[PDB]
């Protein structure tokens, strides 16, 4: 239970993934040339989880970069940390996928997927003990959505007993490339429900609102959104990347977080919320980290946690601080808001600490909630879907690539089922 | 915001306590099965003391004392009084009492019962007895085999106790009564007597030669509201409070309530509770107990007080509900859980 | 002389084993490199410490120990640690992938592939024993390895060594330090499958040890190192009679005979006094009466329950330090007149006492102060059933919704093993309540 | 309160004080249990690989 294999697919998958490797390469003290100049071997003790060791004792991210078009991956090879990536692991067609789930999953993507699986197989064959896979992608376009889920299916086929983990960005009309996004997302959520162990629902809606209402950015870019995403990714992978009490891996996270196999859509939350470049200097005290990280304004999925109940909660606190104070505050939220945690899962809030804070802060806390309020997200996607599907609008773009209306009706149905199960447990009482 | 739960819906007293708690503005009621409570107002039977005091960051407190049933079951009370040295066989304020199991089972005190019985036959003395269980199945008779008949007629263990045949009778009425005192024991084992007690009266002249008609022999509010013709004549609820009883003692007997009765009541209360203290104290425990008790007393013609039973889940009299419950929050609950006297502390250290 | 083998399973079992074996060495005067100057029988012998250590021709004293983890981090830190040289490589057994807090993964999926290797490494130690007594097994209720693999091990130990006695040191799950939400599931599953294979089990509720470390050691937030050094003190007083000259509890059969007259009710409560902070500048040393009296305070128990609302079936007092029988009887006489100590009608009211004159040994740089006398009381009281009631309730809460069940069923377990286990537990709670409560 | 069976030695002493007198499955059944669960595993995995083949 050491190595993880990271795949980033499509425009969004690759921009957020590149930011991920920038951030964590900085945390592990590895420079854009892949060399290491850090001062704590707490930085190298589990560096193998995300990096292979190469000649010169260089460190190469266990990363596969996938796109149906060369635009964004060219820009990754150009960007700050581009040359850290193993060049063979850039796998790209020239087609593009046209924001079209069908081209990603059935036509254009089918042509490229076996090459991707070749690089995957070569990265795994070297793993001393692979724990599984983590994918970054959006569900609104076509490559990341359609091909990304195609990939997840083929990986579960070849490695049915390895953990499948995604960071999947949901679409919002507030941050919207195309009108067919609710179609693509519904089609992928279906896949995700059957085919992943743990999904981080990163709502582009919530990222826009954090940027706008809380960080005071009036015109947010995808860069301001991806700053928040890369902070959350750092936080939720801290337990995996640094030595600790917990000795954390993807499987124990799944076992303790997912009481029911389909209900594995996690709501992430970060504190303190931070604009890029803004050097803010006030110490955050542990009561402040706790209150903020549970605040709905700090969640990356645009749901109201008080409209649901927490099935499970996992938390990481970063920085030099009192673990006594941490236990005190975590107990205090549970005991002061006990209504919002299911009583039929005793002691369902688990907490970890790491000495090393992220770049820029002295203290920080990341939150993973398996909440029933996540249904609000899927309901929103569903309405936007039905609004169009009731008139079969835009459907031709998909039927032209071999798809049948029935497939859409199946996917709509499975998502409405997911919503119903979440509601089941939101009303269940021991 | 302190938090509490409610597992005895039928409880008059703690229904009121729950209402006052919510109206503090700083106490939240949770659902019956939520473990993350400060205060359990618990059930009467099978209260799960095993689960209390294991919630980190929660000081937990409960309104019952594990082990207190030894005092509040008549069989256990007889066993505790005759077995605990600090109480003794040589105990001036409990009626001579024996525990009798029914025939079916065939340890029981029956053959030791009739041995003292027959010396009361031998001695020309009054040998009328009471049998009761823990207006139901009460029989008073001077024939042993009458009751020994009756007790096995019903398949539960009973106690045969001496019947107090010359009781104090209020005039006008020539009629019986018992006294109900309310005692609160807090988490520190402070013993708090409530200033207000009540006399549950009979409204029917006591009659010594017909023991079976029991409206002149049993002062229970139920029996009083049912078979008694004269319910409500002298007192409103067949209840006389302490101002009036004190005044009547002053006018008719030239004593007061404290001197003639209340000293003995305080002696009995603090002896009975200081006895069981080491078996029930939650001093160094991981959860904490208080409990409200109802002690029930009889005064005979000599102004001697006899304990007849301790009640573990007592109802208050309707006039007093407010005051006592306020008190319960003040000293039982608020002492452990502070926010933003109507009791007498029972304490005494005579040196010897 | 009759050798016992210690088996330590999973994280908790292995690290507690580290604590104990370190302690034992210090006590017997064995240095980290295996040499024991005190032993003038170079090459071997049958002293009573030999019950726990064998000897090599070079004078090495090697623990009769097996460590078993399904994953390497912890047993690696044994393989490289202060007692690197103490053990034989062949006694440190490691998997690649652990049980992910899943009872069924440790019992069925990963257990199957390693059970035989462990049994062979165990028999290599048994084949070094002129008269083996049986096994001391250290593990947690909540781990996947500690719960599932331990129970598979216990079944096969019953079949491969059927006449030998088996004793558990079991860590009961505490949310304050607990790693996992499914620890109630694992706890029940393994208690059910290990109940008839275990002769005597000592439960240590991590919550009790944690609060003892806070209240009495002035430790703000205890680590596993604090917890484990205190637990090993307790374990050493429990095992000292197998390792030292004496006549009370001299072999594993005697633990059952003295503490367990009903085979199912084989969970003796352990109380220990005194736990004194080593940083405490001024300490009035406690008397025989004071520490024997501390044995009847719940705050000193390995599991918090209320022995006053139960009955006793056996009570042993193990004193280490300056103690003589006279003072023990004076103390017992006093205590009996101030405390609720009710035995079951069909057992003598009384105490079996053992005294070792060497006071407790504490690890240099530890949290515990040296003391002139200490006592560990082992009492088989029905009050410990409270712990079961706790666990069962948590289990009932989750299982009513079948929460997390799919993780088990997906390892090849069947939903029915859950309700079998839970009904065995219901039986156990009922046995306790009949033995210890009256109508 | 009687003190009985008292033994002494250089290292300690032992004794009893009385305050009041008194008022498995086979190797092959186990390999069968394990192998039954392994085949339940393989069935569930083959159902998964069948659905993926569809
Ligand atoms: N006292 C004590 N408890 C521990 C220790 N390590 C883990 N625990 C407790 O054990 C439970 C988890 O069991 P583990 O021993 O870590 O699990 P395991 O046997 O290694 O099984 P897996 O890792 O799931 O394969 C939790 O309740 C922890 O608090 C320890 O060193 N000392
Ligand atoms: N030894 C005795 N001598 C004389 N009268 C007695 C007596 N024992 C009981 N009584 C009378 O019978 C009445 C009922 O007796 P009992 O003590 O059993 O009440 P109870 O348990 O049914 C309801 P509560 O808990 O409210 O007292 C008493 O109030 C008293 O008037
Ligand atoms: N947060 C975030 N969302 C993005 C980014 N790029 C695209 N999106 C969203 O992703 C969806 C389009 O997916 P995209 O990755 O561009 O298409 P693909 O390359 O074919 O998978 C839309 O919902 C966009 O709002 C990004 O860098 N950050
Ligand atoms: C909050 O971010 C995280 C917090 C985590 O434990 C607190 C973990 C790992 C966890 C682990 O390894 N076992 C667990 C049991 C319950 C909850 C989380 C874990 C984790 O793995 C990715 C991310
Ligand atoms: Ca083509
Ligand atoms: Ca020797
Ligand atoms: Ca056996
Ligand atoms: Mg795009
Ligand atoms: Mg090919
Ligand atoms: Mg482990």
**CA angle B3–B9–B10, rounded 5-degree value:** 140
- Two tokens, residue A25: 């390469």
Q: Which residue of A has its CA nearest to D50?
A: A157
d(C-alpha A392, C-alpha B131), whole Å: 86
Burial bucket for residue B268 (CB in 10 Å: 0-12, 13-18, 19+): buried
Nearest CA-CA distance, residue C298 and chain B, Å: 7
CA distance B269 to B251: 27
- The enclosing H or E element of C386 equals helix C385-399
Q: What share of chain C is helix, strand, coil (3-state, %, to 5)?
A: 45, 20, 35
Phi and psi angles of residue C326, each rounded to the nearest 5 degrees, phi first = -55, -50
Under a CB-based contact definition with an 8 Å cutoff, are residues C150 and C190 in contact? yes
Between chains, do C347 and D22 touch, taking CB under 8 Å as contact? yes
The reported resolution of this PDB entry, expressed in Å, is 2.8
What gap in Å lies between CA C33 and CA C61, rounded to an integer? 9
Q: D48 at the A interface (CB within 8 A)?
A: yes
For residue B126, the number of C-alpha atoms closer than 13 Å in the C-beta half-sphere is 13
Chain breaks in chain D (C to N over 2.5 A) after: 23
Q: Is there a binding annotation on residue A175?
A: yes
Phi, psi for residue B183 in degrees, rounded to 5: -120, 135
Q: Do C129 and C163 contact (CB within 8 A), yes or no?
A: no
Pairing of strands A349-354, A310-319: parallel
- DSSP 8-state secondary structure symbol assigned to residue A48: G
Q: How far apart are CA B264 and CA A405, in angstroms?
A: 90
Give the start-to-end residue ranges of the domains of chain C.
3-259, 269-385
- What distance in Å separates the CA atoms of residue C134 and residue C401, rounded to the nearest whole number? 41
Check: CB of residue B296 under 8 Å from CB of residue B77.
Answer: no
Q: Which residues of chain B make contact with C304, given a CB cutoff of 8 A?
A: 53-54, 286
Q: State CA C29 to chain mean position distance.
A: 23
When CB atoms are compared, the residue of D15, D21, D39 closest to C325 is: D15
Fold that domain C269-385 belongs to in CATH? 60s Ribosomal Protein L30; Chain: A; (3.30.1330)
Beta-carbon count within 10 A of A332 CB = 14
Cβ–Cβ < 8 Å for C211, C269: no
What's the CA-to-centroid distance between C14 and ligand 10, angstroms?
10
Asked if residue B269 lies in contact with residue B346, where contact means CB atoms within 8 angstroms, the answer is yes
Q: Is A98 annotated as a binding residue?
A: yes
* Strand runs labelled E in C33-74: 53-55, 61-63, 65-69
Which DSSP string corresponds to C135-177? EEEEEESSSHIIIIIHHHHHHHHHHHTTTSEEEEEEEE--TTT
Report residue A140: phi and psi, to 5°: -100, -30
The dotted CATH code for C3-259 is 3.40.50.1440
DSSP label at residue A172: B
Touching check for D17 and chain C: CB below 8 Å?
Answer: yes
Residue with CA nearest ligand 3 atom 5: A12
SS (H, E, C) C315-346: EEEEEEECCCHHHHHHHHHHHHCCCCCCECCC
Give the closest residue to B131 by CA, choosing from B152, B106, B111, B107.
B152
Start-to-end CA span in chain C (Å):
48
Distance of alpha carbon B185 from alpha carbon B295, whole angstroms: 13
Q: How far apart are CA A255 and CA C404, in angstroms?
A: 7
- Give the number of the atom of ligand 2 that is nearest the alpha carbon of residue B176: 31
Distance CA A241, CA A134 (A): 14
A159 alpha carbon – ligand 4 mean position (Å): 23
Q: Nearest by CB to D12, which of C158, C162, C356?
A: C356
Token match 């390892």: residue? C411
CA distances from C309 to B70, B186, B311, C188, C290 (A): 12, 20, 21, 24, 23
Contacts of C298 in chain B (CB under 8 A): 284-286
Tokens of B349: 């250290």
The sign one gets for the Cα dihedral A93, A97, A102, A105 is positive
B51 vs C338, C339, C390: nearest CB: C390
CA C289 to chain centre: 26
Q: How far is A56 from chain C (nearest CA, A)?
A: 27
Q: How many CB atoms lie within 10 A of CB C119?
A: 18
SS3 content of chain A, % helix, strand, coil (to 5): 50, 20, 35
Length of chain A measured in residues: 430
Q: Cα distance from D34 to chain C (closest Cα, Å)? A: 6
> Which stretches of chain C sit within 8 Å of chain B by CB?
175-176, 207, 297-299, 304-306, 308-309, 338-340, 385-386, 389-390, 393
**Domains C3-259 and C269-385 equal at CATH topology level:** no
Neighbours of A51 (CB within 10 A): 25
User: Could you tell me which of B183, B150, B219, B179 has the C-alpha nearest to residue B72?
Assistant: B183
Tell me which residue of B299, B190, B186 sits closest to B249, measured CA to CA. B299
- The Cα–Cα gap between B131 and B114 comes to 14
**Disruptive mutation site among A239, A345, A349 for chain C (greatest number of C CBs within 10 Å):** A345
CB A180 within 8 A of CB A149: no
Atom of ligand 3 nearest to the CA of A225: 1
Q: Is A374 in contact with A301 (CB distance < 8 Å)? A: yes
The answer to whether B68 and B62 have CB atoms below 8 angstroms apart is: no
Domains of chain A: 3-268 (3.40.50.1440), 269-374 (3.30.1330.20)
* Cβ atoms within 10 Å, residue C367: 21
Total count of residues recorded for chain B: 352
The span from the CA of A17 to the CA of A21, in Å, is: 6
**φ, ψ at B10 (rounded to 5°):** -70, -5
Chains B and D touch each other (3 or more Cβ pairs < 8 A): no
Task: Evaluate whether A131 touches A250 at the Cβ level (below 8 Å).
Answer: yes
Which A residues, 32 through 91, put their C-beta within 8 Å of a C-beta on chain C? none
B3 contacts A328? CB cut-off 8 A: no
The Cα C258–Cα C251 span in angstroms is 11
Let me know: does B185 contact B290? Beta carbons within 8 Å: yes
Q: Which residues on B lie below 8 Å from C176 (Cβ)? A: 56
Touching chains, A (3+ CB pairs < 8 A): B, C, D
Looking at beta carbons, which residues of chain B come within 8 Å of A336? 1
Structure tokens at A421: 């199960």
β partners of residue B167: B300
Residues of chain C in contact with residue B53, where contact means CB-CB under 8 angstroms, are 304
Task: Compute the nearest-CA separation of C112 from chain D (Å).
Answer: 7
CA distance B101 to B63: 32
Pairing relation of β-strands B288-289 and A90-92? unpaired
Residues pairing with A133 in the sheet: A5, A164
Cα B32–Cα B38–Cα B41 angle in degrees, nearest 5: 50
A323: which 2 tokens? 């673990």
| B60, two tokens | 């937990």
Catalytic residue among C155, C254, C290, C433: C254
**Cis geometry, peptide bond prior to residue A412 (ω within 30 degrees of 0):** no
State how far the Cα of A69 lies from the Cα of C14, in Å rounded to an integer: 53
Distance CA D34, CA D27 (A): 11
Q: Which two tokens stand for residue C361?
A: 């040994």
Name the DSSP class of A297: G
Cβ partners under 8 Å of residue D32, min gap 6: none
Alpha-carbon gap, residue B196 to B180, rounded angstroms: 9
Method: X-ray
Q: How far apart are CA C9 and CA B346, in angstroms?
A: 56
In C, minimum Cα distance to D12 occurs at C356
Q: Measured between alpha carbons, how far is residue C386 from residues A56, A353, A396, C288, C381 in Å?
A: 60, 32, 66, 29, 11
Question: By three-state DSSP, how is residue C234 classified?
Answer: helix
SS (H, E, C) B296-333: EEEEECCCCEEEEEEECCCCCCCCCHHHHHHHHHHHHH
Contacts 24+ apart (CB under 8 A), C393-396: C393/B48, C393/B51, C394/A346, C394/C184, C395/C184, C395/C185, C395/C187, C395/C188, C395/C422, C395/C425, C396/C422
Name residue B291's beta-bridge partners.
Answer: B185
From ligand 6's centre to the CA of C48, what distance in Å? 10
**Spatial CB neighbours of B31, under 8 Å, sequence gap ≥ 6:** A343, A429, B5
**Spacing, Cα A247 to ligand 4 middle (Å):** 9
Distance CA C113, CA C124 (A): 19
Q: Could you give the CA distance from residue C93 to residue C69 in angstroms, rounded to a whole number?
A: 6
Three-state SS letters, chain B: CEEEEECCCCCHHHHHHHHHHHCCCCEEECCCCCCCCCEEECCCCCCCHHHCCCCCCCCCEECCCCCCHHHHCHHHHHHHHHHCCCCCCCCCCCCCEEEECCCCCCCCCHHHHHHHHHHHHHCCCCCCEEEECCCCCCEEECCHHHHHHHHHHCCCCEEEEECCCCECCECCCCECEEEEEEEEECCCCCEEEECCCEEEECCCCCCCCCCCCCCCCCCCHHHHHHHCCCCCCCCCCCEEEHHHHHHHHHHHHCCCHHHHHHHHHHHHHHHHHHHHHHHHCCCCCCCEECEEEEEEEEEECCCCEEEEEEECCCCCCCCCHHHHHHHHHHHHHCCCCCCCCCEEECCCCCCC
CB B30, CB B36: distance < 8 Å? yes
Task: Determine phi and psi for B37, rounding to 5 degrees.
Answer: -110, 150
Q: Name, in order, each residue with C-beta under 8 angstroms of C281's C-beta and a sequence gap of 6 or more.
A: none
Could you give the CA distance from residue C189 to residue C174 in angstroms, rounded to a whole number? 17
Query: Residues with Cβ < 8 Å from C346, sequence gap 6 or more?
Result: D22, D23
Contacts of C352 (CB under 8 A, 6+ apart): C248, C258, C314, C315, C316, C317, D14, D16
Structural tokens at position B123: 């001695």
Rg (CA), chain C: 21
User: Which CA distances in Å does A31 have to A22, A83, A277, A360?
Assistant: 9, 10, 20, 17
3-state secondary structure of C260: coil
Whether C35 contacts C56, CB under 8 Å: no
Other beta carbons within 10 Å of B139:
20
Kindly state the tokens that stand for B238: 């067949």
Query: Residue C84, Cα to own-chain centre: how many angstroms?
Result: 24
Give ∠ CA A377-A379-A385 in degrees, rounded to 5: 110
Task: Please state, in angstroms and rounded to a whole number, the distance separating the CA atoms of residues B260 and A192.
Answer: 83
Query: Residues near A7 by Cβ (< 8 Å), separated by ≥ 6?
Result: A13, A63, A64, A66, A116, A120, A133, A134, A135, A136, A148, A151
Q: What's the residue count for chain C? A: 439
Residue C9 · residue C150 · CB < 8 Å: yes
Helices A405-427, A181-195: axis angle to 10 degrees equals: 60
Opening angle at CA A385, ends A147 and A202, nearest 5? 55
Torsion sign (Cα): C122, C123, C126, C127? negative
Nearest Cα neighbor of C47 from C239, C206, C234, C245 is: C245
Q: What's the CA gap between B97 and B130, in Å, rounded?
A: 9
- Whole-angstrom Cα distance, residue A151 to residue C374? 64
CB contact at 8 A, B211 and B186:
no
User: DSSP alpha helices (H): ranges in C201-349?
Assistant: 206-217, 224-243, 252-259, 288-294, 325-336
């Amino acid at each position: 239970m050491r190595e993880i294999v990271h795949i980033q697919a499509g425009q969004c998958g690759n921009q957020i993934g590149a930011k991920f490797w920038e951030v964590i390469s900085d945390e592990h003290g590895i420079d854009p040339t892949g060399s290491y100049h850090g001062d704590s071997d707490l930085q190298l003790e589990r560096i193998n989880v995300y990096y292979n060791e190469a000649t010169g004792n260089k460190y190469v991210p266990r990363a596969i970069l996938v796109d149906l078009e060369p635009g964004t991956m060219d820009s990754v090879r150009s960007g700050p940390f581009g040359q850290i990536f193993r060049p063979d692991n850039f796998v790209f067609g020239q087609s593009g996928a046209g924001n079209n789930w069908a081209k990603g999953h059935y036509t254009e993507g089918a042509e490229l997927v076996d090459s991707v699986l070749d690089v995957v197989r070569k990265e795994s064959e070297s793993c001393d003990c692979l724990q599984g896979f983590q994918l970054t992608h959006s569900l609104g376009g076509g490559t990341g959505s359609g091909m990304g889920t195609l990939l997840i299916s083929k990986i579960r086929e070849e490695y049915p007993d390895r953990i499948m983990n995604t960071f999947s960005v949901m679409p919002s009309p507030k941050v919207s490339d195309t009108v067919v996004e609710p179609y693509n997302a519904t089609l992928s959520v279906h896949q995700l429900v059957e085919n992943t162990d743990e999904t981080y629902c990163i709502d582009n809606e919530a990222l826009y609102d954090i940027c706008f209402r809380t960080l005071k950015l009036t015109t947010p870019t995808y860069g301001d959104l991806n700053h928040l995403v890369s902070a959350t990714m750092s936080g939720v992978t801290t337990c995996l990347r640094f030595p600790g009490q917990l000795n954390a891996d993807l499987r124990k996270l799944a076992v303790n977080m997912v009481p029911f196999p389909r209900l594995h859509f996690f709501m992430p939350g970060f504190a303190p919320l931070t604009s890029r470049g803004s050097q803010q200097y006030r110490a955050l005290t542990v009561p402040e980290l706790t209150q903020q990280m549970f605040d709905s304004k700090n969640m990356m999925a645009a749901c109201d946690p008080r409209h649901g109940r927490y099935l499970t909660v996992a938390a990481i606190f970063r920085g030099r601080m009192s673990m006594k104070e941490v236990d005190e505050q975590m107990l205090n939220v549970q005991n002061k808001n006990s209504s919002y945690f299911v009583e039929w899962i005793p002691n369902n809030v688990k907490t970890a600490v790491c000495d090393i804070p992220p770049r820029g802060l002295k203290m920080s806390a990341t939150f993973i909630g398996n909440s029933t309020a996540i249904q609000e997200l899927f309901k929103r996607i569903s309405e936007q879907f039905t609004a169009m599907f009731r008139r079969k609008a835009f459907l031709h773009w998909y039927t032209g690539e071999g798809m049948d209306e029935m497939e859409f009706t199946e996917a709509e149905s499975n998502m409405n089922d997911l919503v119903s199960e979440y509601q089941q447990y939101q009303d269940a009482t021991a | 915001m302190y938090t509490f739960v409610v597992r005895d819906e039928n409880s008059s007293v703690y229904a009121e306590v729950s209402r006052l708690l919510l109206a503090t503005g700083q106490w939240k009621r949770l659902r019956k099965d939520n473990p993350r409570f400060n205060l359990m107002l618990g059930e009467r039977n099978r209260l799960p003391f095993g689960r209390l005091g294991h919630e980190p960051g929660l000081v937990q407190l409960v309104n019952y004392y594990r082990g207190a049933d030894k005092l509040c079951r008549k069989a256990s009370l007889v066993k505790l009084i005759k077995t605990s040295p600090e109480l003794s066989e040589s105990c001036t304020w409990f009626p001579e009492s024996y525990v009798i199991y029914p025939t079916n089972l065939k340890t029981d005190e029956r053959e030791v019962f009739l041995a003292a019985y027959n010396r009361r036959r031998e001695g020309r003395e009054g040998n009328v007895w009471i049998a009761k269980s823990s207006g139901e199945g009460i029989l008073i008779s001077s024939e042993a085999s009458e009751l020994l008949d009756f007790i096995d007629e019903q398949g539960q263990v009973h106690v045969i106790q001496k019947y107090l045949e010359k009781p104090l009778l209020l005039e006008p009425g020539h009629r019986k009564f018992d006294i109900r005192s309310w005692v609160l024991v807090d988490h520190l084992y402070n013993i708090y007597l409530y200033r207000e007690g009540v006399l549950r009266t009979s409204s029917e002249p006591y009659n010594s030669a017909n023991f079976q008609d029991k409206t002149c022999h049993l002062t229970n509010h139920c029996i009083q509201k049912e078979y008694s013709k004269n319910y409500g004549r002298y007192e409103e609820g067949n209840e006389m409070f302490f101002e009036e009883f004190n005044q009547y003692l002053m006018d008719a007997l030239n004593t007061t309530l404290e001197n003639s009765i209340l000293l003995q009541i305080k002696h009995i209360i603090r002896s009975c509770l200081m006895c069981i203290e080491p078996a029930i104290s939650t001093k160094h425990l991981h959860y904490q107990s208080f409990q409200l008790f109802g002690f029930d007393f009889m005064v005979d013609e000599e102004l001697k007080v006899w304990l007849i039973e301790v009640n573990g889940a007592p109802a208050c009299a309707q006039k007093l509900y407010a005051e006592l419950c306020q008190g319960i929050v003040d000293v039982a609950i608020s002492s452990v859980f502070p926010l933003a006297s109507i009791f007498i502390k029972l304490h005494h250290h005579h040196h010897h | 002389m009759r050798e016992c083998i210690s088996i330590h399973v999973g994280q908790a079992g292995v690290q507690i084993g580290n604590a104990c074996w370190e302690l034992y060495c210090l006590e017997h005067g064995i240095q980290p490199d295996g040499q024991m100057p005190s032993d003038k029988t170079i090459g071997g012998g049958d002293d009573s410490f030999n019950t726990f250590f064998s000897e090599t021709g070079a004078g090495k004293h090697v623990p009769r120990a097996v460590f078993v983890d399904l994953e390497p981090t912890v047993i690696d830190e044994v393989r490289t640690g202060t007692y690197r040289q103490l053990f034989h490589p062949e006694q440190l057994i490691t998997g690649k992938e652990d049980a992910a807090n899943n009872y069924a993964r440790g019992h069925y999926t990963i257990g199957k592939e390693i059970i035989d290797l462990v049994l062979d490494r165990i028999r290599k130690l048994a084949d070094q024993c002129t008269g083996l007594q049986g096994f001391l097994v250290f593990h947690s209720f909540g781990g996947g390895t500690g719960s599932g693999f331990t129970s598979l091990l216990m079944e096969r130990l019953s079949v491969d060594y059927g006449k030998k006695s088996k004793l558990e040191f079991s860590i009961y799950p505490a949310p304050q330090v607990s790693t996992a939400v499914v620890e109630p599931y694992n706890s029940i599953l393994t208690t059910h499958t290990t109940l008839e294979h275990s002769d005597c089990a000592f439960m240590v509720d991590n919550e009790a040890i944690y609060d003892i470390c806070r209240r009495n050691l002035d430790i703000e937030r205890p680590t596993y190192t604090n917890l484990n050094r205190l637990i090993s003190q307790i374990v050493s007083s429990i095992t000292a009679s197998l390792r030292f000259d004496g006549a009370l509890n001299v072999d594993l059969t005697e633990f059952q005979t003295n503490l367990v007259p009903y085979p199912r009710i084989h969970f003796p409560l352990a109380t220990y006094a005194p736990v004194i902070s080593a940083e405490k500048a001024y300490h009035e040393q406690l008397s025989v009466a004071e520490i024997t009296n501390a044995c009847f305070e719940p705050a000193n128990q390995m599991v918090k329950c209320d022995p006053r609302h139960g009955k006793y079936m056996a009570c042993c007092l193990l004193y280490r330090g300056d103690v003589v029988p006279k003072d023990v009887n004076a103390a017992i006489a006093t205590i009996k007149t101030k405390r609720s100590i009710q035995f079951v009608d069909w057992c003598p009211t009384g105490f079996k006492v053992g005294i070792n004159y060497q006071p407790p040994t504490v690890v240099p740089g530890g949290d515990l102060a040296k003391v002139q006398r200490a006592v560990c009381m082992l009492s088989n009281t029905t009050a410990i059933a409270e712990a079961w009631a706790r666990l069962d309730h948590k289990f009932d809460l989750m299982y009513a919704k079948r929460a997390f069940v799919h993780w088990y069923v997906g390892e090849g377990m069947e939903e029915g093993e859950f309700s079998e286990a839970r009904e065995d537990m219901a039986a156990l709670e009922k046995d306790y309540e009949e033995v210890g409560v009256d109508s | 309160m009687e003190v009985i069976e008292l033994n002494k030695c250089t290292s300690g002493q032992s004794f009893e004080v009385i305050l009041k007198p008194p008022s498995d499955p086979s190797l092959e059944e186990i390999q069968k249990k394990l192998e039954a669960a392994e085949e339940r595993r393989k069935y569930q995995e083959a159902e998964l690989l069948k659905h993926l083949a569809e």
